[PDB]
Amino acid sequence: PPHWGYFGEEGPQYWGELAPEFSTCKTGKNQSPINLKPQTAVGTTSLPGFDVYYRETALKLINNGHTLQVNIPLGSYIKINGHRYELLQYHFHTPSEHQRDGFNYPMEMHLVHKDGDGNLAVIAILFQEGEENETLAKLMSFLPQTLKKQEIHESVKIHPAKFFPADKKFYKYSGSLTTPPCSEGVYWMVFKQPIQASVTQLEKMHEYLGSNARPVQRQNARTLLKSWPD
Amino acid sequence: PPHWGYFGEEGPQYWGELAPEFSTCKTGKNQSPINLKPQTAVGTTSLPGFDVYYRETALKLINNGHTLQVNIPLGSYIKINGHRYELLQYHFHTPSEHQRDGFNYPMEMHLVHKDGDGNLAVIAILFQEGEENETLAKLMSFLPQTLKKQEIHESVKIHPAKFFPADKKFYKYSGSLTTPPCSEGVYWMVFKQPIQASVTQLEKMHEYLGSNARPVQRQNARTLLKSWPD
Ligand SMILES: [Zn+2]
Ligand SMILES: [Zn+2]
Fold first, then answer.
1. Could you say which DSSP state residue A223 is in?
2. How far is B212 from chain A (nearest CA, A)?
3. How far apart are CA B134 and CA B137, in angstroms?
4. CATH classification of B1-230 is 3.40.190.10, yes or no?
5. What are phi and psi of A118, to 5 degrees?
6. Taking every annotated instance into account, which residue ranges of this chain make up the domain Alpha-carbonic anhydrase (chains A, B) (predicted)?
């Protein structure tokens, strides 16, 4: 499996050309992220919402070269209309990958879920500058200084739903992974409301991660849904 | 370009393996057709509707080996929310390709549109047994007995909008072509209400076409939309 990254010949424009297994990055018509345009988004009257069943667990953390990833032990899940997906992990992007009207946010966060058949559901949370984020602060104390370590902290418990915004409105669309092999068939939900982190918090995250965001992909035939009515 | 059909080693389960250009038939996550489940469909408050601008022209007709196709001259178009697609053709499938709650209809009809950038939008109309369809009856008088000719009739005019149901409600989703190369990125609208054709009409169409319907594909990460609210 070839090396890929966010700059140069390895960068996002060349992903689809790096190896046969990566080709969807270039040939897919339902890719993520997308530019989110609220004016263009379609209101709904019965879009399924989701129920969160996350349990408190020791912090397992890794800088895998492409992102900072928190690995979740089996036992946490969501239910989208009674359909159950297991929380596998969450990780971070600086700057954000999704845009609002063509503008990036300073940071984006992805909570990755999978069901029994291999189906993926992702919850995306956007950050903007503002109040210090206490939940983020717990995490940042333990940023790994080593690449590709797994770094366990038994006594640190962070509930991932602490990162959820107060407003529960979200956008939903059918998309893909934003990293190779860019697999499609991903159920995306993106919270409308960004949460806040401090400027110095956002800066340290960016300094740590570098720029690890994929450029926005064409919406094509897809409809962007709102979870509330117009 | 390799030969494909609807039975045997050339059949739909194998399309994706007949040639590299056909691989999306096998690897796609947003394929058509789908089983349409009215219970699962999500009502909307501001999904774009469409305006129909079709003009009356001589009947150009061809059996291309896989279907019966009526070719439309440049000048007919629809506008989806002010965005314009040109009508290229319409053609027929027996039995239907889309299902409702797992049941096929006797026949399905596809109006294919393409815009300037190559984006495709298909309007699908379902047939059920019932009244003799007069518009269908004109068309059947001129079924080509020759493969791959174009068979023009200057004096026969059929307005394609005659095939539209009285009820204008529809289901919409993001999908694909239902034939190789199974290109994705197709904007699908399927009328909720079937129109009627006589048992003898449907029977003769089926006998003419053979079985030319692709099996239903997994909905995966897609939401099925209704053009009206709950
Ligand atoms: Zn991500
Ligand atoms: Zn068709």
1. P
2. 25
3. 5
4. no
5. 100, -5
6. 2-228
Contact B85, B76 (CB under 8 A): no
Q: Which residues of A are less than 8 Å from B175 in CB distance?
A: 221
Angstrom distances, CA of residue B61 to CA of B78, B142, B147, B192, B211: 21, 8, 11, 27, 20
Contact: B45, A46; criterion CB under 8 Å:
no
User: Is omega for the bond preceding B48 within 30 degrees of 0, making it cis?
Assistant: no
Question: Using CA atoms, how far apart are residues A188 and A178, in angstroms rounded to an integer?
Answer: 11
3-state SS of chain B?
CCCCCCCHHHCHHHHHHHCHHHCHHHHCCCCCCEEECCCCCECECCCCCEEEECCCCEEEEEECCCCEEEECCCCCEEEECCEEEEEEEEEEECCCCCEECCEECCEEEEEEEECCCCCEEEEEEEEEECCCCHHHHHHHCCCCCCECCCCEEEEEECCHHHHCCCCCCEEEEEEECCCCCCCEEEEEEEECCCEEECHHHHHHHHHHHCCCCCCCECCCCCCCEECCCC
Cβ neighbors of A69 (< 8 A, separation 6 or more) are A61, A62, A63, A89, A90, A91
**Residue B51 C-alpha to ligand 1 middle, in angstroms?**
39
Contact B121, B105 (CB under 8 A): no
**In this complex, do A45 and B175 lie within 8 Å of one another by their Cβ atoms?**
no
Between CA A6 and CA A13 the distance in angstroms is 9
Whose tokens are 């993001």? That residue is B174
To what resolution in angstroms was this structure determined? 2.6
Name the residue type at position B187. Y
Give domain limits for chain B: 1-230
Neighboring chain A residues of B42 at a CB cutoff of 8 Å: 44-48, 225
